[PDB]
Structure formats: C-alpha cells, structure tokens
C-alpha cells in the first residue's frame, strides 16, 4: 500500500485545478472543482448522486461536442468556472 499501490496514485502535481460546473437541461446544476489532471468522471458521478440523475440515461456535453467519462479537463481544454451541459436521451420529466 505504498509503492505498489499507494493512496496517491497520481504524480506530484502542482495545485492547478479548475471549477467545472455541471448544468442540465433538467435545471439541475452544481459546481465541482477538481484539478486539471483529474477525469470529469469525478464530477459525472457525483453530480448524479446529488441530483439525482441516471449515468446511462444522461450524457455529460460540453463545448458543442458529447464528453466521456474518460476525458480530462486539460484534454478538451476546459477552463475554470466554464459550464457542462446534460441533457436526458431517454424521458426523466
């Protein structure tokens, strides 16, 4: 539990994070922020969790273009406090 699998996992990284905001078509929207190098899914779960909304049901879209689960912040050159948008590919409301 420590140079085979330790807590960390990641690099020494620098404290550059980033405030996403997750907002749904639904009206549900709450702000997350995780670090540069850290994946959406993070904030993809968790808004799910709070909001009360279904992973498979949903679809996470940001900048005119569906995301993943998989992809980081720094990949699609997301900035601070910029905005995801959900939408429900099945009914829900």
Known sequence: ????????????????????????????????????????????KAYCERQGLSMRQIRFRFDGQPINETDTPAQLEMEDEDTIDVFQQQTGG
């Open 1 to 44: 539990m420590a140079d085979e699998k330790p807590k960390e996992g990641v690099k020494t990284e620098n404290n550059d994070h980033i405030n996403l905001k997750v907002a749904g078509q639904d009206g549900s929207v709450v702000q997350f922020k995780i670090k540069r190098h850290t994946p959406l899914s993070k904030l993809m």
